[PDB]
Design a protein around this nucleic acid. Sequence first.
RNA 1: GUAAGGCGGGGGAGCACUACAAGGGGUGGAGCGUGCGGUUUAAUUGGAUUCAACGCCGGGAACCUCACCGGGGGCGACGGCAGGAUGAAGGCCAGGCUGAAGGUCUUGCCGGACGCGCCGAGAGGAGGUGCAUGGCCGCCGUCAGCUCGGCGUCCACUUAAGUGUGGUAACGAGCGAGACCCGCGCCCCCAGUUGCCAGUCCCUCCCGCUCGGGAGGGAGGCACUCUGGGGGGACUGCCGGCGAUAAGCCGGAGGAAGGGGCGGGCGACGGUAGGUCAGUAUGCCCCGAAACCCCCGGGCUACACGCGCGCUACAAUGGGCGGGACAAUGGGUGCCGACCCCGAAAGGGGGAGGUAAUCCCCUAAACCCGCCCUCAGUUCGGAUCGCGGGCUGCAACUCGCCCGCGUGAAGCUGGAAUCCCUAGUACCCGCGCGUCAUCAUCGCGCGGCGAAUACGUCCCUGCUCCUU
RNA 2: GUCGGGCUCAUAACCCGA
Lengths: 101, 50, 55, 197, 134, 213, 130, 123, 143, 67, 66, 95, 149
Amino acid sequence: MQKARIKLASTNVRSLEEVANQIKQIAERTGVRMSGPIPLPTKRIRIVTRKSPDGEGSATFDRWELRIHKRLIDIEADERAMRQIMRIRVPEDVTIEIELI
Amino acid sequence: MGQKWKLYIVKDGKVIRKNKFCPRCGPGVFMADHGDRWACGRCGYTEWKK
Amino acid sequence: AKADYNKRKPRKFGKGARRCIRCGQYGPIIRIHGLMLCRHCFREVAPKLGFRKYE
Amino acid sequence: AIERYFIREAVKEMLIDEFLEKELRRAGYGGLDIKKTPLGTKVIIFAANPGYVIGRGGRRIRELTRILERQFGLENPQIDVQEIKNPYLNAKVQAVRIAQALERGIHFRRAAYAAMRAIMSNGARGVEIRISGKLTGERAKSVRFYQGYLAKVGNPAETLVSKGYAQALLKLGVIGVKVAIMPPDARLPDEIEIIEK
Amino acid sequence: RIIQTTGKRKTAIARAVIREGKGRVRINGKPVELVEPEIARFTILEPLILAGEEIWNSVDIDVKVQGGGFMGQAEAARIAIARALVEWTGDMNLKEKFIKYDRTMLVGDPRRTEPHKPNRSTKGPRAKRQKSYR
Amino acid sequence: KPLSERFFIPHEIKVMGRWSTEDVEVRDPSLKPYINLEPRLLPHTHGRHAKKHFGKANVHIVERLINKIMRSGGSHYKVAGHFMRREHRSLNSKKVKAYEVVKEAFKIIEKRTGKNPIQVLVWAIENAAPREDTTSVMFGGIRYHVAVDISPMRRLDVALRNIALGASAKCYRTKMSFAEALAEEIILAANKDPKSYAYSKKLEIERIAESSR
Amino acid sequence: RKEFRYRGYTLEQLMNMSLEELAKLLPARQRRSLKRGLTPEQKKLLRKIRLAKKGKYNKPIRTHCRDMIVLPEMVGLTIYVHNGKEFVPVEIKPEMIGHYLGEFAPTRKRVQHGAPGIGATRSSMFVAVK
Amino acid sequence: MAKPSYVKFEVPKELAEKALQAVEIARDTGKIRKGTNETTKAVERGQAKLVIIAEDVDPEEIVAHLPPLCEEKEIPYIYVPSKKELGAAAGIEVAAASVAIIEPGKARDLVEEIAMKVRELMK
Amino acid sequence: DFRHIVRVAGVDLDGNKQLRWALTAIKGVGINFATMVCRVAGLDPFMKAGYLTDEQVKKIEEILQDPVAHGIPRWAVNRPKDYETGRDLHLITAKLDMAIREDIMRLRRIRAYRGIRHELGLPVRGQRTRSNFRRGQTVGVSR
Amino acid sequence: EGYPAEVIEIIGRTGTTGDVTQVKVRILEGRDKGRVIRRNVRGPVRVGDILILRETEREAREIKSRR
Amino acid sequence: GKIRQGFIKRVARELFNKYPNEFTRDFEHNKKKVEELTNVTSKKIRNRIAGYITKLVRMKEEGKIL
Amino acid sequence: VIRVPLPEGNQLFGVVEQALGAGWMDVRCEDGKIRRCRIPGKLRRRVWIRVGDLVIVQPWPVQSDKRGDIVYRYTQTQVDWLLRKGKITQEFLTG
Amino acid sequence: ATVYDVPGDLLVERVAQRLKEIPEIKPPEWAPFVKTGRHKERLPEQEDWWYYRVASILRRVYLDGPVGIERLRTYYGGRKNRGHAPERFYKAGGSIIRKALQQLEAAGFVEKVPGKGRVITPKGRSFLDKIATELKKELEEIIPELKKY
RNA sequence: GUAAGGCGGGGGAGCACUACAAGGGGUGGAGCGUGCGGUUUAAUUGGAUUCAACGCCGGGAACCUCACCGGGGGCGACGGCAGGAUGAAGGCCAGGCUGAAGGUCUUGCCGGACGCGCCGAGAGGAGGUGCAUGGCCGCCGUCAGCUCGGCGUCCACUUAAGUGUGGUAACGAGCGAGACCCGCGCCCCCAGUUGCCAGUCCCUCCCGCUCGGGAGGGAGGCACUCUGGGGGGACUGCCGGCGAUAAGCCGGAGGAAGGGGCGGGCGACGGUAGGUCAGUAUGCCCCGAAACCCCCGGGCUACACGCGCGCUACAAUGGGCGGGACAAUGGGUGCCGACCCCGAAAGGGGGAGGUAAUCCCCUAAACCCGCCCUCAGUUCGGAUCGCGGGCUGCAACUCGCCCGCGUGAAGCUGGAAUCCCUAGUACCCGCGCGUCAUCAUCGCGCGGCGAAUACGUCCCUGCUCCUU
RNA sequence: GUCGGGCUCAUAACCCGA
Ligand SMILES: [Mg+2]
Ligand SMILES: [Mg+2]
Ligand SMILES: [Mg+2]
Ligand SMILES: [Mg+2]
Ligand SMILES: [Mg+2]
Ligand SMILES: [Mg+2]
Ligand SMILES: [Mg+2]
Ligand SMILES: [Mg+2]
Ligand SMILES: [Zn+2]
């Protein structure tokens, strides 16, 4: 039981689905239920900045952006599954967090 | 650079240092003789010289 | 002591309490979500932090 | 929250990289990447001559890690040197090599021709060098060399072309160099073939 | 049996539910007979008033609206009500009358605001400052 | 103000629930296919017409009247004397207020006269439409102002704007309100009375147009 | 209408009041400034006005602290205030208490205007630059 | 340690050699407290091990401080022929007065011989 | 019994206005303060001033002479904490402007910064004076 | 007052600033009733319109070869 | 101006005179038979090639090709 | 204190009576002798002189009568600056 | 019938008149000399302005759940005429609302949820729904369409 | 001299609301907010002057920022000289000079090797030069051009386009345009927490006393909304008419959408001696016991005046009072603060839950209903000044912001001139971020309510191609 | 004729007000 709760977050959306699918496999290969990856709203951060170093000329601007994608997963607490989700080898730009409920 | 290190109330036959020590550090570091208080020299004391 | 007249004063609010991490200037400093850079140094190093200019 | 964590670890890399440029200018610094494992990180530095970066038996590396742990974060660093993957497709390196050949005393038209010949020999699609400073006179000028296909505008000329810039200080002043390369496996959208039977 | 439909009008979504009944229609709890800005009360009554005192007295409707404003919610409710009335009854001599009168009672309106640009940027995409030679 | 008129419930598809356009009659054959008189319970179409050429032909005439008083007045041309720059207290995007003043004008017109208010409006927008005009022509190098003819759609637009502006000056800094100044203008135009503003403007257009035939 | 009274209290009466029962009779600014304590430089200045008031310090009092608030200890003596370049004599009288110290030492010279020059109007700009 | 214009006693040469040559070997191994007005206090505590006082200080006022104080301590000492050699034995190039040290490393046999020689001889 | 001009506390005031708006003609009474004194004297603020009998004028004038001692709060008076004595006073037409005159003469006697700006006739509460506050007449260079 | 006419063909845009249009109209009651003349109009014109004109004998000056 | 592009025509011809019986007068058939006979990875580009091929098969099957 | 072209060496002050043209300007000097000044090359481009403005000039000792040479010019900021210190008297401009 | 079945302002007018019988509601004695917020300019003009505000606060927690003071100040705020500067929104004061809720609580009509705000009791629901029914029974004499429900 | 092709008041063709024509709103006249020229000052620090200088240098400067004016005090790696363990460099209790200071001096102690009294060099420089440079940026211009192995790049027609189709001493190419990337509007699949509540079921409460109707909880479910990964859909594809029958253009059906679907990102070879050395980098020339570094107090906030961009009004298409309605973008641990109590208000004392679809900022204003005002310098307008209470800060006088009572200026529709806009656009109304300890009449974005006119010309002001 | 503002890249000529 105990419905462990894993939370991924990353900037490359391609490098997230593969970790989610590894976990989906590990659940399916074993006998255990799983709440499919729930998408939480993207958190885009935005920065506007003037484009010229001095003050001459007409004023034109920039719009730089950085988007951060999130997911959510529930799963039952089995050593046969917990052990398997511990050697999963996340990539570098993927942040993972586990905590029992 | 001149010369000034003397008048410790020091004689021959025996020696009795004039200015006492600073209790803050150990023995050796002497005291000041301004005429109203005993000034450490590098520590910190104004005990109104005995 | 002669080591008391080349020493600054520690502000904690005002334009002289924040300076650029890369250039070292006081004034137009971006302080959004933590980052602390001039408006001139950001625009030329934003692609290496991961920002993009979509729209 | 969480974005403050995602953009606090993108500034450390930027500062470390910008310091290593100045420090490892010679022997051809290429780039780095940090790997955060338990109990410590792992720094990798793709130089072009590990001889200058390692030192005499490895006494430069001791200083490098001491700085990388004291002046920056990186609670437990471990460096090891490597060799560039493809030195002739990495414009950010050719800029520095041309700049050095300049500030050693070669004419500004032998340097560019030799460099373009090497890059277009090792199998690129096209290259563009632009040298602009106070060469041959007191009034500034600017020249330009190029060889093949090279996109300039649009999304394909923001992700496929690799470009770098470097200064070449001299006895009279500075001279700016800018290179740009298109790797041999590009495939613009314009290019379609007929998958036949 | 019951049915449920949807209508949207510039940041204003409406959900309606229809079933057999006595002829009463509520919008967010308010009976439509009590809606103050009459220009907004006549908007949510056309799909009903055009079908007659016969179909009107055999259904009960209740709409849940949210977003937009007092005039961008009335049209959302109207789209929801017409789209429901054309399914409950299931006759096409009524779908005909809902398109000679107003085609958007059944297809919708795709218009949203436009992002502003920089010359004033707080007035509109195309509003600018005042030029000054000399 | 009486609750029987505050909470009003129509049972029938009449224009604004009060009056019916069945025995109105457009005598002028030129302005017949542009004055729309179809059932149209509520006169508000959300501006879906001003995107297709010749589109405003199928828009109920009461709505064209309502749209043409959502204005401040004369903001770069003096009208009967002065400018009338009303900023921040004009009804420029308030359609509820314009709808109310047109309803109240119609209620006053039905009482002083005793006829269908739309019959009176359709009489008035035919005595205010001009049928001759003047322009210029470049030809070989010089110009000179001549007489031309007016097309019916333009006749209707000018007539309506002139009624709006004529009514919009009698309520300016005066004890009279705007719902009743809009009724005093229509009643006066449909009688071919000189004290009007819309009728006099047609006379002064046609006259100085004939001067230059 | 011959004695000076501040709120019904004469000078020698409001002179021996403490620093907390007096600040009830001052405006809101002065009360809040007295409540956050005197700054160390104002402490060094008050430490020197109380000497000059008792028996000692027959020597001109000068200061930079334009923020001091005239208090009934300072009524009688003449102190000098720095207006940017010079120390300006500001004799203290009753009806000054409550006011700031720089309020009696002006800091900008009065401007008595000359005649417009070239560029002062749109008719003198382009006929003068050649 | 006053000027040689003070008849304290005679001075041999063997102890001179094996105590002025006792400094370099103790200089490359310990912590040196040169000068006079520095280690007067350290020997006031009594921590300096092998002090080496010379006879060159002039005029005779700041000259006799330890001979009046040798009679209250253990004072393992010698007398020194001149000054330049004392400056060369440790430190710098000036006219030296008493270069006293603590912990003479590798230089304790000379201690056991001539230090106790001068101890049993006179004081 | 209607009267067309009533005289209360000095100035005589209209008789065809609402009592709360006729009491504003007194210099030293606004609309927020007149409502208070009509509500304290205990009579309606919408009655026409001409219907004031004599006892009511007497009550109004009495309330105008010490408003605090009748029920008006002391955060709603003309000047609280008088400079000569710590009382709370509300002054009207003829004695109000004398108070302001003495309040400016005091600042002029000690030669404060705010009394000199009153001498010169220049802005007192710290405005900017390069582009506005232009009361004089134009000047030229040549034409 | 005025005899009406029916627009049956457009010819192009005249005008010092492109405002008038030249068209070919057919009169349909009065003294002529059937003659085909040419005139200039101010405003937007379709085919099938019905203008109201007050002279019936003016014959607008011919346009520059329609182009 | 809905002018057809230069590489649209250049390939739409090249695979019509190479497989001249594998394209009918119908639009939705062409759209599929185009996506499998080339390496197009866009979607607006196969729609236009399919349209040009349709216009080629209806001109060469009726008469004068120009 | 200030950077002004006062008399430095053998200077003069230029207040022109008339311009005949072609580079010759005639100044009403307090000397009495009518000095006919000329123009060097550096001031015929960047600055611009007219009549009635006090300027500086350099004479040549040849006859001390018809000589003079501008080397710098006076502004409007200085025309009345050079009066309070009493360096030059204005009445020779009006008499 | 409930308070969802009638127009709000006619109900508030009818409820204020009944509120004059509960001896717990009585205006504080600083009421003749105040205005209701920093965004107003003049004082309330009607004499029973207390009863309207109370009766509008009662109907205000009935149909908005557990709610507190700092959220009843955003409802009773408005736009300000601040001189030469552009207009701007501000909240309202607090004492007028706090006293109203305390007096209603002492009447028995509202009560305090620990840590969430204030709710309405069975007694207050009875009070409001009975008046709402009495109002609707005489609003079907003129609009015969409210007869249905 | 401080480093010896284009134009023409010629001809064709084609375009653009920073052009006109048809229209909607104004600016120019009054008061104030702010930037500028000019005068004044100990200083009122500098750059920019038609479009393309003037709420611009992210420039809302109380100290700092800071470059300006008055005063005070510090700094010479390293070589080699005067001097130096008999003790160089350097530190301090108390008190004087002082704005205040072991900064100096009176007074006597301390530390243990170097040493600006000297010479050479060196750090450092918001000091000069943008007309010595690099990088970046505005404008010709999102225009249709610039070239390679005079022509090709020309002519006719066509296109938003050197975009295409035919004829051509031409045939082939490159970069720019297009393709490309991010959003918006319709349908389907996979997902169901922190998002959602329609149908069933338990429990409590209220109304016409209950047959009917309504409101809250917990059990359950992903139905609908939503969130976000992947797919579909539109191609001049189908029908009619011009044009050659080719390029293409006009009209119509079906469609959620139609003819680059709509709104944005991306700016070629070069020029402009255009702006920036005062964001960083940099050559040459100058300061180098000072032009470098710090601390206190003033200044950039002065005021006969001319100008630019705006805010509030000159009232009824309104002012005031009391009631009633409906959002979106974004932000939060040095911070956001629900909830209870004290105060008339600004504000004050406690204080849950939040490192985020979970808790908070966050029940917008214009709009609708009732009563007072009735065309007046007023119940319009709210500058200007008096007295009192507060918030941030080490410090509110010069020179901050907020609240209550009082006072009540010009202004009754604006001469000659002149600006912005083609559809969810302009006008009208409020909100969030940035700067920020405190302070928005500004910049950049958000939604609410919502029109009039024209689908055209080269008349005026400009720009592109061929020809003379 | 005098001061001020308009039009032009800027001055003359031209338009408007005090
Ligand atoms: Mg400063
Ligand atoms: Mg330049
Ligand atoms: Mg060009
Ligand atoms: Mg230049
Ligand atoms: Mg400034
Ligand atoms: Mg008012
Ligand atoms: Mg202040
Ligand atoms: Mg002129
Ligand atoms: Zn920076």
